[PDB]
Ligand binder design. Structure first.
Ligand SMILES: [Mg+2]
Length: 1105
RNA sequence: GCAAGAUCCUGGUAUGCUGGGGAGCCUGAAAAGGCUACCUAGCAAGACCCCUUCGUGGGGUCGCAUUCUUCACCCCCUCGCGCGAGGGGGUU
DNA sequence: AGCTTGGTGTATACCAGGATCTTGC
DNA sequence: TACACCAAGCT
C-alpha cells in the first residue's frame, strides 16, 4: 500500500519531547503535511525528583541484591571458620546488646585467661567485625589494605576529638573500645550520624574504614596472643571482598574482527603499534617536499623505541641521532600541540611503557619472583605479550596459567596501563606484520590484511540498536517508530532534517543549575533595572545593565589608572576585539577610565601595558584571585571560580587568541548517535542526505517566515506584555519539525549568521540567493500550517507503558495490626484482613453468596459475637484468637513477614453497567502488587484482562458501586486506561465542568487530556494534552515574584497546574463522544483492532471476546 | 597523542524499615508499655538450575532496563540442521 | 451526601574505579 | 516529583 511521494523528515529533539513531521514536497516547495505529532516522553527517568533513570534504579537494586547475597555467603564462610576454631558466633537473640562491644573492648584492653570465655569473646568480636567492617577501596587487595597506615588518619582525628570531648584516655583507642565505652558510659548515644533527622552529637562523625577494624583485630590478636596463621585466616575471612570486574559484552567489538574483543593499553601490541604508527606518520623533508621515511630509518627508530626502559628518547633526539639528518626542522607530521622553540619536540616520544613498568617492578622484586623474571626474559615475545594480556585484562568477569596463591600475588596487585584502544589484539598483530616489513601505513595495511576497500569506514549503528543513554534511547525509539511507519506509508524520505535544542549530556544537573542561575539572572537584573529607572532611564538596553553590574561589583574603579569614575565615565572595554577572534561576552568587558581605555590599541591587554610605564600586571589578577563572593549578584558560586579563572586566563595572554569560529554541525552525543543511525537507515534505504542542525535555528526560520504559534492555535495571551512562548503549546514541536523540513545547511548557516548579528547588539534581513529562494519556495507553508492546525491534525501523544514490570510495592515495611475473631468488626478492619483464606471466610460470614466484600469503611458490620468460630481449611480460629490485619485501610500486601503499601497503579480497568442511554462507570485500579500476588507476573498472561481474585487490594479497595454491580453481573470490562492515555472529548469538550475547571475552559477550551493518575476509587487525574506543565510552573514562579506580569488567563493556568483536573470518573465518562485515543507512531489514531492497542469509546465498547 | 564530562557497570559502606532481642532511662511498680541507642535475620513478590540422602533441607543464577503486556505477523544478532533466547517494527 | 479542594507521605545517601561514547584542543 | 490517600469544606 506504499505510494512513493517526495517527502522530507523533520525531527525536533528536546529533553522531554520530540516533534516529528513528514512533509510531502512538489517542486522544492511544501505541498502536504502528511503527519505532524509531538511525543511527550519521560527521558527514561524513573525517579522524578532525584533525576535517576529507570536503568540506574534497576542497576542499583540489582547490585544491592548481589551485595546482600555475597555478604551472606561471606558471613557463612566466617561462621564455618569460627566453628573450625571453636569460637562461638554472636547469637541471634537472648544477649545483652553490648556483648559484642564489651567483648572487643575487653579483648583489646586486657588478656583473657579463661580459655572458654576467651574463645567465646573472640568469636563474638570477629562475627561483629564481619558485620561492621567499614569501607575500603574495592580495587585494593587484602595485602594492599594491610599496608595502609594503622590506624588511619581519619580515625586518629576522630579519636583525638573523642578525648577532647570525654577527657578519658583509652589505650589503644580502637573503635570497639571507644564505642563500647560510650555505650556503657552515655547510654542511648548514636555511633554514626544519621540521614536527615532537639540536638545530639553522635559518637563518631567520619565513615569507618576497613583498616581501622583490621588494626583493632590485630591488636586483639597481639594482646590475646593469637597464632599468625589463624590471624591471617580471620583477616581473609572478615575482609573477603569480591573483585570489581568489568564484565564481557560491555567492551566494544573490533570494527575489523567483530568476534574478537577489544585490546588494552598494557597489551604490548598497542605500544609497538603506537611506535610503528608514530614513526610512519613522520615526513622527512626530501626532494623539496615531504617524503615519508625510508625502511632502514624506520627499522632503526622502531628498534630504538621497543628496547628502552624510560622516557629517554624524545623527538629532538630522534631526528639528529637515529634518522641521521642535519636539521631538526627537516621533519614534519608530529601529532602534538604546536608551540615556539619546538614545544612538541620538548616532550617525549611514545615507547613501550608497559615493558618499562614491568622491567622496573622486576628490578624491585626479582629476588621475590625469580621464576616470573626468568620466564619474562627467556620466553618468547608472543608468550610474554599473551601474559601481559592475561594480567591487564584479568579485571574482566568473562587464570589461564594456573599458578599458586602467592607466586602470582606479587603481580596480581600490579597496576598496569589501562584503557581500550580501538582495535583487537589479533588485528593489532595482523596489521603489525604488514608495517615493519612492507613499510606501509595503517591506511594501507588495513586494506591489505582484512581486504577492505578504500572507502571502507567503521560500520554505523542501526536504528534498532540502543545507546544506553535514557534520553537518547527514548528519542531514538520514538524516531525509529515514526520513520518505520512513514517508510511503510509513503516510502523512504527524500531527505532527513534534524535539530537538537540543548538539554543533553548533563544528568539534568545543569537543569537545576540553569533554573537557579536564571533565578539570579532575573533577580539581580531587577536591582540595576529599578535603580536606573529611579535615575531616569527611559530606553532600556542590556548594555546599561551590563555596565551597571560592572560598576556594582568593581565599585567604579579604573584599577590601573586610579582616578575614581562615575556612570558617565564608564567606557565599556572589550578586552578581546572581534578583529582578533572574539565575541560579545560579559567576560570580555572591563570598566575603564578613558586613559586606561583607548591605549590598548587592539594589542593583547595587560601585555602592552606592562611593556610601558605607569601600569603593570601581577597585582590586580591576585586581587581577582582573592575575590570574596557576594551573596546578592548575577554570578553564582559555581560560575564564580570559572569566571575568575577565565578572566585571569584571558588577561595573561601573550599571543593571539583565534578565531571568529561558528558551530560546525556536530557537538553532542545524541546528535552524533542519531546522525549515525539515520545515515545507516539512509544508506540502507536510499535517503539522499541527512543533516542534524542546532538551536535556535527553527525559531528564526519561523520568525523570518512569520509563523506564530498563537496565530496557529488561537491561544490566549498568558503574559501582559508580548504573547506566550512557543513552549506553552506542545504542538509547537511538530510545528518546528514541519518548518525544519524546509531548510538546508546553507540557509541554516545564513540564519545562524542573522542570529549572531541580531543578538550582537539589528534588525537586519538576511541577503543571499539561497535564502531568497528558500523564502519564496516555502511562502505557502504557513497557509498549510493554518489548514493543519484548524483541522485538529497536529497530535500530542504520550507513549504507553504496558509491561507489568517495575516496583511491585513500596519499600517501607509496616507492623501488622491484630484483631480478635469475636469482636465487633467494622468495614475497614474486614478490608484489612491480611490472610486471603481468613478474608474469604469473613466474607462468607458477612455475605455467604457474595464473591466480593461490599462494606462501608465506617459501618459496623459485625457485633461482638463471643461464640464465633472461623472454620479454615487446616485449622479452626477461636473467638479469642488473633487475626493479622494490615495497619492502614489502603492497598497493601504481605512481603517477608511484613506489610507494604501497593505502588502506583499499573492500569485501571473500565467497568460499565446499566442502561445504554445512561450507564454508570467505575475504575478497577490495578497495581503491580495485585498481579504479583495474583500469580499473573508470569510469561503468557494478558495483565489488562485476566481476572483478579477478590482478596487482591484492587478488589478490596474498589468502589462500592463497582463491587455491587460486579456481584449483580451487569458490569463488564470494556477497556483499560494507563497513565499516559489520551482522552478526546470531541468538539463538545468538557460539558460537565464545575468549579475552577469551568473558568479554565473559558480561556483554554481543551478537548484532549492525558491520564496521569488514579487518586482514589472514584477519581481519575487528568492534565491538558496541549499545555505544558513546565511553562505553567515558570508562570507560577513569575506570579510568586514578578508584579502583574501575567494576564487573567495566566492566573487561571497557574492556579490550575500542577494538580490539574482531579475528576470524578462518572463525570468524565458520562461525556458522550468521549474517546480513548491510542495513536500510531505518526500520530494517527489506531481504530482497527489488531495486535496493538486501539482507540475505543467507553460508551460504545463491547465486552471482550 | 591529551585535559576532562555524561551514561551505565562492578565492588562495597553507613543509616533506615520490619521480625526476633535488650544496655540505660521513664511510666507500672504486680504486670508489661514507651523512648534513646545497639545486637541479630531479611530487605522487592518470586521464577529457573543442581542435589540424592524420592525428600528434609541445602548450594548457583535471574528478578524495578530496553514505555504498543500477552497473543499473532515481519525483519535482524548468536547458537542450533525448523527453534531456544535476545532486539526491532507494525501504516487507520 | 457527593463533588471540589487542600495538605501530605513516599528508602537515602555516599565511596572508588572500569567500559561505551562525547568533547576540543 | 507527583501520585495515592487522608480528611475538611461547599453546595
Ligand atoms: Mg521543541
Amino acid at each position: 500500500g506504499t505510494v512513493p511521494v517526495t517527502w522530507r523528515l523533520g525531527v525536533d529533539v528536546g529533553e522531554r519531547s520530540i516533534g516529528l513531521a513528514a512533509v510531502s514536497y512538489e517542486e522544492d516547495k511544501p505541498k502536504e503535511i502528511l503527519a505532524a505529532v509531538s511525543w511527550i516522553h519521560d527521558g527514561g527517568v524513573g525517579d522524578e525528583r532525584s533525576g535517576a533513570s529507570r536503568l540506574a534504579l534497576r542497576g542499583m537494586a540489582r547490585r544491592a541484591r548481589r551485595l546482600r547475597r555475597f555478604r551472606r555467603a561471606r558471613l557463612r564462610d566466617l561462621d564455618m571458620l569460627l566453628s573450625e576454631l571453636g569460637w562461638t558466633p554472636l547469637p541471634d537473640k537472648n544477649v545483652s546488646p553490648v556483648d559484642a562491644w564489651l567483648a572487643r573492648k575487653r579483648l583489646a584492653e586486657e588478656y583473657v585467661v579463661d580459655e572458654t570465655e576467651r574463645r567465646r569473646l573472640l568469636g563474638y568480636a570477629v562475627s561483629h567485625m564481619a558485620r561492621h567492617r567499614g569501607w575500603r577501596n574495592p580495587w585494593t587487595t587484602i595485602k594492599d589494605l594491610k599496608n595502609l597506615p594503622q590506624p588511619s588518619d581519619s580515625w586518629e582525628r576522630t579519636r583525638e576529638s573523642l578525648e577532647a570531648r570525654y577527657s578519658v584516655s583509652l589505650e589503644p583507642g580502637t573503635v570497639g573500645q571507644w564505642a563500647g565505652y560510650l555505650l556503657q558510659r552515655a547510654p542511648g548515644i548514636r555511633l554514626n550520624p544519621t540521614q536527615q533527622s532537639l540536638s545530639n552529637a553522635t559518637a563518631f562523625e567520619t565513615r569507618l574504614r576497613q583498616e581501622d577494624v583490621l588494626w583493632e583485630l590485630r591488636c586483639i590478636a597481639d594482646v590475646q596472643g593469637l597464632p599468625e596463621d589463624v590471624v591471617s585466616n580471620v583477616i581473609d575471612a572478615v575482609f573477603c571482598q569480591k573483585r570489581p570486574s568489568v564484565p564481557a559484552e560491555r567492551i566494544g567489538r573490533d570494527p575489523l574482527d567483530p568476534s574478537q574483543l577489544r585490546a588494552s593499553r598494557a597489551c604490548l601490541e598497542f605500544q609497538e603499534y603506537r611506535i610503528v604508527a608514530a614513526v610512519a606518520n613522520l615526513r622527512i623533508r626530501d626532494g623539496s617536499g615531504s617524503r615519508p621515511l625510508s625502511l632502514e630509518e624506520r627499522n632503526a627508530v622502531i628498534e630504538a623505541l621497543l628496547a628502552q626502559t624510560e622516557r629517554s628518547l624524545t623527538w629532538s633526539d630522534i631526528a639528529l641521532e637515529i634518522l641521521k639528518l642535519p636539521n631538526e626542522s627537516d621533519l614534519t607530521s608530529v601529532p602534538e600541540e604546536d608551540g615556539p622553540s619546538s614545544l612538541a619536540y620538548s616532550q617525549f616520544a611514545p615507547f613501550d611503557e608497559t615493558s618499562a613498568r614491568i622491567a622496573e617492578f622486576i628490578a624491585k622484586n626479582r629476588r621475590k619472583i625469580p621464576t616470573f623474571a626468568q620466564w619474562w626474559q627467556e620466553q618468547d615475545r608472543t608468550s610474554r605479550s599473551d601474559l601481559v594480556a592475561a594480567l591487564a585484562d584479568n579485571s574482566i568477569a568473562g587464570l589461564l596459567v594456573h599458578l599458586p596463591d602467592a607466586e602470582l600475588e606479587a603481580l596480581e596487585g600490579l597496576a598496569l596501563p589501562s584503557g581500550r584502544v580501538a582495535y583487537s589484539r589479533l588485528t593489532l598483530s595482523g596489521l603489525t606484520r604488514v608495517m615493519r616489513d612492507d613499510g606501509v601505513d595503517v591506511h594501507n595495511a588495513r586494506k591489505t590484511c582484512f581486504g577492505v576497500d578504500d572507502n571502507w569506514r567503521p560500520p554505523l549503528p542501526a536504528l534498532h540498536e540502543a545507546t544506553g543513554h535514557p534520553v537518547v534511547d527514548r528519542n531514538l525509539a520514538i524516531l525509529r517508530k515514526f520513520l518505520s511507519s512513514a517508510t511503510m506509508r509513503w516510502g523512504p524520505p527524500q531527505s532527513i532534517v534534524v535539530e537538537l535544542a540543548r538539554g543533553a549530556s548533563e544528568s539534568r544537573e545543569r537543569q537545576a543549575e540553569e533554573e537557579a542561575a536564571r533565578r539570579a539572572h532575573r533577580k539581580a537584573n531587577d536591582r540595576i533595572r529599578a535603580e536606573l529607572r529611579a535615575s531616569g532611564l527611559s530606553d532600556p538596553s542590556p548594555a546599561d545593565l551590563v555596565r551597571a553590574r560592572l560598576l556594582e561589583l568593581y565599585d567604579c574603579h579604573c584599577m590601573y589608572c586610579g582616578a575614581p569614575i562615575s556612570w558617565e565615565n564608564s567606557e565599556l572595554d572589550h578586552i578581546v576585539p572581534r578583529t582578533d577572534g572574539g565575541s560579545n561576552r560579559h567576560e570580555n568587558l572591563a570598566i575603564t577610565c578613558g586613559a586606561c581605555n583607548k591605549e590598548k590599541g587592539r594589542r593583547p591587554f595587560a601585555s602592552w601595558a606592562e611593556t610601558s610605564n605607569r601600569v603593570q600586571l601581577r597585582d590586580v589578577i591576585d586581587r581577582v584571585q582573592k575575590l570574596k563572593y557576594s551573596g546578592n549578584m548575577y554570578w553564582t558560586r559555581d560560575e564564580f571560580s570559572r569566571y575568575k579563572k577565565s578572566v585571569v586566563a584571558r588577561l595573561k595572554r601573550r599571543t593571539s587568541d583565534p578565531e571568529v569560529i561558528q558551530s560546525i554541525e556536530s557537538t553532542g552525543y545524541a546528535a552524533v548517535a542519531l546522525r549515525d543511525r539515520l545515515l545507516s537507515y539512509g544508506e540502507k534505504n536510499g535517503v539522499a542526505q541527512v543533516a542534524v542542525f542546532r538551536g535556535g535555528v527553527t525559531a528564526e526560520a519561523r520568525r523570518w517566515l512569520d509563523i506564530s504559534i498563537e496565530r496557529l492555535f488561537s491561544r490566549v495571551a498568558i503574559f501582559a506584555q508580548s504573547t506566550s512562548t512557543k513552549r506553552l503549546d506542545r504542538r509547537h514541536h511538530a510545528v518546528d519539525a514541519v518548518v525544519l523540513t524546509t531548510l538546508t545547511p546553507g540557509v541554516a548557516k545564513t540564519l545562524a549568521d542573522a542570529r549572531s548579528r541580531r543578538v550582537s547588539a539589528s534588525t537586519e534581513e538576511p541577503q543571499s540567493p539561497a535564502y531568497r529562494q528558500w523564502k519564496e519556495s516555502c511562502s505557502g507553508l504557513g497557509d498549510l500550517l493554518i489548514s493543519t492546525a484548524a483541522r485538529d491534525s497536529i497530535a500530542v501523544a504520550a507513549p504507553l507503558r504496558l509491561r507489568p514490570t517495575g516496583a511491585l510495592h513500596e519499600e517501607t515495611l509496616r507492623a501488622f495490626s491484630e484483631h480478635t475473631v469475636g469482636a465487633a468488626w467494622k468495614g475497614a478492619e474486614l478490608r484489612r484482613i491480611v490472610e486471603p483464606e481468613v478474608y474469604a471466610a469473613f466474607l462468607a460470614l458477612t455475605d455467604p453468596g457474595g464473591r466480593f466484600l461490599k462494606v462501608s469503611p465506617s459501618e459496623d458490620v459485625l457485633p461482638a459475637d463471643e461464640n464465633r468460630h472461623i472454620v479454615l481449611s487446616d485449622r479452626v480460629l477461636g473467638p479469642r484468637d488473633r487475626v493479622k490485619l494490615f495497619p492502614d485501610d489502603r492497598g497493601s500486601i504481605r512481603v517477608r513477614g511484613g506489610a507494604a503499601y501497593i505502588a502506583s497503579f499499573h492500569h485501571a480497568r473500565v467497568f460499565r453497567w446499566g442502561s445504554s442511554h445512561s450507564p454508570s462507570f467505575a475504575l478497577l485500579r490495578v497495581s503491580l502488587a495485585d498481579l504479583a500476588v495474583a500469580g499473573l507476573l508470569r510469561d503468557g498472561v494478558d495483565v489488562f484482562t485476566a481476572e483478579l481474585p477478590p482478596w487482591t487490594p484492587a478488589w478490596r479497595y474498589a468502589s462500592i458501586a463497582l463491587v455491587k454491580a460486579v456481584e449483580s453481573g451487569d458490569a463488564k470490562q470494556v477497556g483499560w486506561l494507563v497513565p499516559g492515555d489520551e482522552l478526546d472529548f470531541g468538539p463538545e469538550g468538557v460539558t460537565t465542568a464545575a468549579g475552577d475547571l469551568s473558568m479554565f475552559l473559558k480561556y483554554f477550551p481543551e478537548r484532549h487530556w492525558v491520564v496521569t493518575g488514579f487518586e482514589d476509587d472514584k477519581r481519575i487525574n487528568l492534565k491538558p494534552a496541549f499545555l505544558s506543565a513546565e511553562q505553567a510552573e515558570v508562570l507560577r514562579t513569575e506570579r510568586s515574584d514578578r508584579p502583574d506580569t501575567l494576564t487573567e488567563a495566566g492566573e487561571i493556568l497557574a492556579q490550575f497546574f500542577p494538580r490539574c483536573w482531579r475528576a470524578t470518573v462518572a463525570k468524565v465518562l458520562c461525556h458522550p463522544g468521549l474517546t480513548v485515543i491510542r495513536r500510531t507512531a505518526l500520530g494517527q489514531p489506531r481504530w482497527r483492532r489488531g495486535h496493538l492497542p486501539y482507540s475505543w469509546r467507553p460508551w460504545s465498547a463491547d465486552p471482550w471476546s
